[PDB]
Amino acid sequence: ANTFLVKEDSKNVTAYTPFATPITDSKSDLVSLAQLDSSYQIADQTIHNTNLFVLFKSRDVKVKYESSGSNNISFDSTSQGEKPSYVVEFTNSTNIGIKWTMVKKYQLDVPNVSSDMNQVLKNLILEQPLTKYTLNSSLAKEKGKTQREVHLGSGQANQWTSQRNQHDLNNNPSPNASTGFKLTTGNAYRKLSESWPIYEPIDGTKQGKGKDSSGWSSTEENEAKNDAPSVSGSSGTFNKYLNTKQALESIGILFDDQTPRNVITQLYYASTSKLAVTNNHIVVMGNSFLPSMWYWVVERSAQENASNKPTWFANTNLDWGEDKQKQFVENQLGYKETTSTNSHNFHSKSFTQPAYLISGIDSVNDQIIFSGFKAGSVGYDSSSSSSSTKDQALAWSTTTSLDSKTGYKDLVTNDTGLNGPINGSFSIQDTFSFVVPYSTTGPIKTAYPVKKDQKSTVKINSLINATPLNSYGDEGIGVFDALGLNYNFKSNQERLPSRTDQIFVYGIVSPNELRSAKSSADSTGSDTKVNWSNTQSRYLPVPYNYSEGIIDASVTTFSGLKSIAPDGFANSIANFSVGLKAGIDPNPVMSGKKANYGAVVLTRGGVVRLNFNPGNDSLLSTTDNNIAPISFSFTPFTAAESAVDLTTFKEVTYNQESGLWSYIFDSSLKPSHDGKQTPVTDNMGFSVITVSRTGIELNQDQATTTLDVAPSALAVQSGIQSTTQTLTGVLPLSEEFSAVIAKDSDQNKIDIYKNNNGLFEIDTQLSNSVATNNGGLAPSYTENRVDAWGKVEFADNSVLQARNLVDKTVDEIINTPEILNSFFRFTPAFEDQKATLVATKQSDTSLSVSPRIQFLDGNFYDLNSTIAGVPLNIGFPSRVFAGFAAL
Ligand SMILES: [K+]
Ligand SMILES: [K+]
């Protein structure tokens, strides 16, 4: 398709030509055309074999979780909120223009809930989502019991050597290791049936109520409402809470008046955000804002008015790399036994990581690509009565030890922190570290923080965090875990990874793999599992230089950590990802081998490159355990790219000619108000980041058959940007030129940006030239000027006598391209703009010529050029030459 589609708002999509003009009548209310009510908006859209596929979701959607009976999750039929999300396939029915017409429609239903899932969901509790305005101090939580307060109790410290063997903690040198963090304060946790508040606390160490629903509505809510009142078209203090209602509206939180709808409705709304199409499937996943606990796998072959069922992430096993890497995640999901009446959590019911913050989803060839962060999910003790971990989340640093052999496989499979706590704070001679030094009796036993005694008489249930952090523990290991600051003291000095905090996840899912996820989703009775083995994990912290004044040699923790983050987030500890796209590399490969492809995704302070073997559509790898999985490469941002507000991400396109990704950011996406209820005024403008591959690419030649280096990428603030204008769209015409449509007032203006040695700058003269289009689809040809089409000077008729061409014939001259090229002088409008003449016998004696001329997009245009089958009628000149012979 030689046209470009452009979402002009929540409902309408319009086709643009490469001249930044709308195709007449192509502007389409797709919501209306999908026969859906006006509460529906477009969430994502895609081209697949020339048809348009659109994901719609409703602002009216309301969802219930009744934790008793069956079919536990369902839409609120009463009022009207049975407004499920739909995927729709449109085709173009005209040959002249764009008339879209609906072909298939798919309702995305609410998940089945096996009896066995529902016991976890009874007591599942979820953190309020991270916003733009959430502070490191907001996220901090009160430090929980030490490893020996839980096991031994209130007797003494100096039993720890004699007493640890009976609690299966042999040789563990960490009685003073945290078992996580208190839920009596901090960010709010809520069950699927309750609601999150609009207030976040500035110091969650002191001002949350945490999971104490009761306490909130009884005590703390009127206090926070006193401190942080909603603007009205009072203004108050903000000593203790931010009011983030508007920043919540911003990331897709839904409301009745000033109250957010229940968690289950926010999970559903946020879970229908991204789509991707194959010949056989539509897959639908969630946004990078909320954790998503399920995805949909629609079979294109599905019947009308059917009910496409989502698959639980809890039912979907990934390869985390090595096997120990997966066990780290599951061991911290909750307490496991076959002694515990009603101690029901994801780990005890034999489920796996239940929640991802999805970066996005795409299809290449016939494969779904995805990436994301593991959303923190752990045990919390929910008992009453006098249980010592009561009201406490059970979490700990799983960060490698210092003495761990350097070499990737050896680092991520180090046994340090596998079964319970060991990390905290240590000093050897006068060298300090948060990480355990070691890793003669036997082994160094880690064990889950539940006193063997009270084992049947404890209540460990599941929680899900709003970020990629397991432990909010207001201690030093927390900051080094999240920021990437645990290093060993050896020859090379190597960064020691977490296998629980800040874990990035990516993969390629095959059609058979999809067919199981659907099979899991329709299973009646018991949970059916699904293996995605084309997948990997990676420790991916936020860059430390997004913070200040951190101490190493009072040691800095989350509650005191100064953020200087420039990427539109107040916090400097939680990582974020957005806009995963794939593309096929257009740079041919040694034949005998299939097109190379990859994907990129932005993360805090860097681009990441996903690498694949197109042979067997797998992840790239190398024989060597030592070196780090070559499926992943991270390239840090420079100051210019770090300045971009990631929370304003709008769109990402690939272009197979350039082999370049364009990330568009639109500042109109900022919330109306700050957490201090101050109006936001830097909401004008936009920014484009350009990504391109680097490194030696697979199968360029005999030597590159294999690789022990990961192909990387590079993000560049391209130079296309504005703080003044309202974006409408960015047409990436070619490697050399981009077109921005925008308003300054209320009428659209076209700017052309030109690529100068890899930096794009506005060409005021090309812009005014392309804009001069007389209300037509394409820019005017102008006889005495060098406008968008350049300037064409025809030879005088007397060039024929001059060059003895009178002796040649129309029919001869027409099959001599290089002779009629000498019938004009072209002055181009941009470097290496080309132009040919096209002849046409008019008589026995005469021909005429009309030029074929390159535009910004690389393509030639002439008198018969069409876009979407609609004649452009560009108005190039013509010329008759006469006095040729008839031999
Ligand atoms: K593996
Ligand atoms: K250039």
Residue 565 CA: distances (Å) to CA of 135, 136, 645, 829:
11, 11, 10, 43
Domain end marker among 773, 794, 818: 773
- What is the whole-number distance in angstroms between the Cα of residue 625 and the centre of ligand 1? 12
Going by C-beta distance under 8 Å and a sequence separation of 6 or more, which residues neighbour residue 120? 314, 344, 345, 346, 349, 351, 461, 462
Strand partners, 85: 108
Closest listed ligand to the CA of 537: 1
Token reading at 651: 């769109």
CA 196 to CA 211: how far, in whole Å? 10
Ligand (nearest to CA of 735): 2
Cα–chain-centroid distance for residue 390? 36
> Nearest bound ligand to CA 322?
1
Residue matched to tokens 């040699």: 553
Three-state DSSP class for residue 478 = helix
Q: How many Cα atoms within 13 Å fall on the side-chain side of residue 707?
A: 23
- Mark whether 746 and 796 lie in a shared domain: no
Pairing of strands 241-243, 199-201: antiparallel
Please indicate, yes or no, whether residues 277 and 320 belong to a single structural domain of this protein: yes
751 and 871 in a single domain? The answer is: no
Cα(319) to centroid(ligand 1), Å: 5
Task: Using the mean position of ligand 2's atoms as its centre, give its distance from the Cα of residue 822 in Å.
Answer: 28
Experimental technique for the deposited model: X-ray
d(CA 668, CA 671) in angstroms, rounded, equals: 8
Same domain, 292 and 382: yes
Tokens of 834: 């080309």
Is 728 in the same domain as 815? no
Query: Per-residue DSSP letters for 562-616?
Result: EE---SS-S-SSS--EEEEEEEE--S---SSS---EEEEEEETTEEEEEEEETTT
Report the C-alpha gap between 82 and 63 in whole angstroms: 8
CA of 228 to the centre of ligand 1 (A): 50
Contact (CB, 8 A) for 770 and 20: yes
Instruction: Specify the amino acid at residue 440.
Output: T
Closest ligand by atom to 534 CA: 1
Q: Judge contact between 269 and 252, C-beta under 8 A.
A: yes
Token pair listed for 69: 């009976």
**How far is the centre of ligand 2, averaged over its atoms, from the C-alpha of 705 (Å)?**
33
Closest CA to 130 of 472, 433, 415: 472
Handedness of CA 573, 578, 584, 585 (dihedral sign): negative
Domain identity same for 766 and 836? no
Choosing from 738, 753, 773, the residue where a domain stops is 773
Spatial separation of the C-alpha atoms in residues 100 and 15, rounded to whole Å? 11
Measured in Å, residue 756 CA sits from the centre of ligand 2 at: 5
Residue 764, φ and ψ in degrees, nearest 5:
-55, -35
What is the token pair recorded at 630?
A: 């070559």
Question: Are both 388 and 495 inside the same structural domain?
Answer: yes
In 321-397, which residue ranges form alpha helices assigned H by DSSP? 323-331
Residue environment code for 485-513, b if the CB has 16+ CB neighbours within 10 A, otherwise e: bbbbeeeeebebbbbbbbbbbbbbbbeeb
Same domain for 622 and 742, yes or no, is yes
Domain boundary among 752, 773, 794: 773
Is the distance from CB of 528 to CB of 520 less than 8 angstroms?
A: yes
Give yes or no: residues 629 and 686 share one domain. yes
Please tell me the distance between residue 820's alpha carbon and the centre of ligand 2 in angstroms: 30
Phi, psi dihedral angles at 821 (to 5 degrees): -60, -25
Q: Which residue has the tokens 């002055």?
A: 827
CB-based contact 293:464 (threshold 8 Å) = yes
Query: Which helix (DSSP H) or strand (DSSP E) does residue 662 occupy?
Result: strand 660-666
HSE (side-chain half, CA atoms, 13 Å) at 453: 8
For 220-260, give the secondary structure using H, E and C: HHHHHHHHCCCCCCCCCCCCCEEECHHHHHHCCCCEECCEE
Sign of CA dihedral 645, 646, 650, 656: positive
Tokens of 493: 């000095």
With residues binned 3-state (H G I as helix, E B as strand, rest as coil), the percentages for the chain, rounded to 5, are 15, 30, 50
Asked if 176 contacts 387 with a C-beta cutoff of 8 angstroms, the reply is no
Q: How many whole angstroms from 619 Cα to the centroid of ligand 1?
A: 11
**Cα dihedral across residues 389, 394, 397, 400: positive or negative:** positive
Measured in Å, residue 346 CA sits from the centre of ligand 1 at 22
Taking the CA atoms of the chain, what radius of gyration do you get in angstroms?
A: 31
Task: Name the residue range of residue 678's domain.
Answer: 4-773
DSSP string, 602-655: EETTEEEEEEEETTTTEE---S-SSS--TTEEEEEPPHHHHTS-GGGEEEEEEE
699 CA from centroid of ligand 2 (Å)? 28
Distance 493 CA to ligand 2 centre (A): 42
Q: Counting ligands in written order, which one lies closest to the CA of residue 760?
A: 2
Same domain, 356 and 257: yes
Beta bridge partners of 839: 849
For residue 761, which ligand has an atom nearest its CA? 2
Residue type, 106: Y
- 676 C-beta neighbours (distance < 10 Å), count: 14
Phi, psi torsion values for 119, nearest 5 degrees: -70, -30
Dihedral of CA atoms 42, 658, 604, 276 in degrees, nearest 10, equals 30
φ and ψ at 793, to 5 degrees? -110, 115
Task: Spell out where the chain is interrupted, by the residue before each break (C to N > 2.5 A).
Answer: 233, 385, 439, 553
**Ramachandran assignment for 79, one of left (phi > 0), alpha (psi -120 to 50 degrees), beta (any other):** left
CA of 736 to the centre of ligand 2 (A): 6
Distance CA(779)–CA(736), nearest Å, equals: 19
Beta bridge partners of 725: none
Largest CA distance in the chain: 119
3-state DSSP assignment of residue 559: helix
Query: Tokens standing for 810?
Result: 């129309």
H or E element at residue 116: helix 115-121
**Residue holding tokens 């409408």?**
728
The bound ligand whose nearest atom lies closest to the alpha carbon of 536 is 1
Q: Please indicate, yes or no, whether residues 737 and 795 belong to a single structural domain of this protein.
A: no
CA–centroid distance, residue 712 to ligand 2 (Å)? 23
Residue 558 contacts residue 571 (beta carbons within 8 Å): no
What 8-state DSSP symbol labels residue 673? B
H or E element, residue 381: strand 377-381
Runs of H (alpha helix) within 463-553: 476-483, 511-522
Residue 734 CA to ligand 2 center (angstroms) comes to 11
Q: What total number of domains does the chain contain?
A: 2
User: Distance between CA atoms of 271 and 281, rounded to whole angstroms?
Assistant: 17
* Rounded Cα gap, residues 650 and 667, in angstroms: 9
Residue holding tokens 């739909």?
A: 86
87 and 118 within one domain: yes
Q: Using the CB atoms, write b or e for 198-217: b if 16+ within 10 Å.
A: bbbbbbbbebbbbbbbeebe
For residue 487, the CA-to-ligand 1 centroid distance in Å is 26
Residue 179 contacts residue 396 (beta carbons within 8 Å)? yes
Q: Which ligand is nearest to the CA of 631?
A: 1
